[PDB]
């Protein structure tokens, strides 16, 4: 059983680090953008069954986006924002919508969703935890996470509701 | 822009600024293509029918058929609406878009017809007989 999830978001939301964070178990301050899209290849328990989950990492810098071809056969995207930076919570509309078209889902209004909220351990928070609840309840109830990379919190948690809702799409 | 907002409303199925858009076109206070193409990213080559169809918004694609929306307008993997609303299984788009005199032979770029890319059993049986008439 493959599963494959793909992450979007602006540059600098924290994509990279909640994939290393979940996959490695490791964090860096340092800032190094990601180029074009790859994948790693994670196994993941989703209540008993071991899953095997591809999750595509990608480029928020326009520069270094190439196309979206990879989007297809994907079973969950992931919305990814920092809730330091009121702009990237206003790009998610516009990345949700160019996944559907691009991807063409056959059941468009269900296809599973999951928002991360990113960089709650940092001062200066610009999004309202319920600004970000209402958006994602009013697309048919995307399940909407809080989580900080740096210190590992709601990581396990987000990904395992996005491995569940991935295999349910899956099958 | 005029158009921008025909491809979000259609896109979000709202009829009544849809039908506000059109009735406003029909009387040439605005300039606006009712077969215009997005080139966002969130609808790069799509028309509002295209998008309409797709998300399943009925009465904005009755509203675009009866303001003469172009039945056969293609995107850019060749698919037409009624591809896009065979593919996601909407029956009731599919009939109205035949009653629009929807082309049933369009072969879209990757060599499927509409019949042939839904999942829908009463919607294939029905394309069926209509391709079988109209080739
Ligand atoms: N304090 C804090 N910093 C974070 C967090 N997540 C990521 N960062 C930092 O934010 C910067 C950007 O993180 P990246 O993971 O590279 O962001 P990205 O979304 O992958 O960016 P692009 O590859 O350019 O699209 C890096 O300097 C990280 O150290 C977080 O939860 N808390
Ligand atoms: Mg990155």
Known sequence: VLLKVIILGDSGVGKTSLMNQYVNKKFSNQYKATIGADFLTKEVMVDDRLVTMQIWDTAGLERFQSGVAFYRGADCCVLVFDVTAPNTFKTLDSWRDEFLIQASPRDPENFPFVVLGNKIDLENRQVATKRAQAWCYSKNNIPYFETSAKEAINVEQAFQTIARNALKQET | ?135
């Open chain 2, 1 to 135: 822009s005029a158009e921008q907002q025909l491809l979000h409303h259609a896109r979000n199925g709202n009829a009544e600024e849809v039908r506000q858009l059109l009735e406003t076109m029909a009387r040439n206070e605005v300039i606006a293509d009712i077969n215009c193409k997005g080139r966002s990213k969130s609808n790069l080559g799509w028309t509002p029918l295209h998008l309409a169809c797709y998300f399943g918004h009925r009465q904005v694609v009755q509203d675009l058929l009866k303001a003469g929306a172009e039945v056969n307008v293609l995107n850019d993997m060749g698919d037409t609406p009624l591809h896009r609303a065979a593919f996601t299984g909407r029956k009731e788009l599919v009939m109205l878009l035949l009653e629009y005199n929807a082309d049933t032979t369009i072969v879209n770029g990757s060599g499927q017809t509409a019949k042939e890319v839904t999942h829908a059993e009463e919607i294939r049986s029905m394309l069926e007989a209509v391709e079988r008439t109209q080739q």
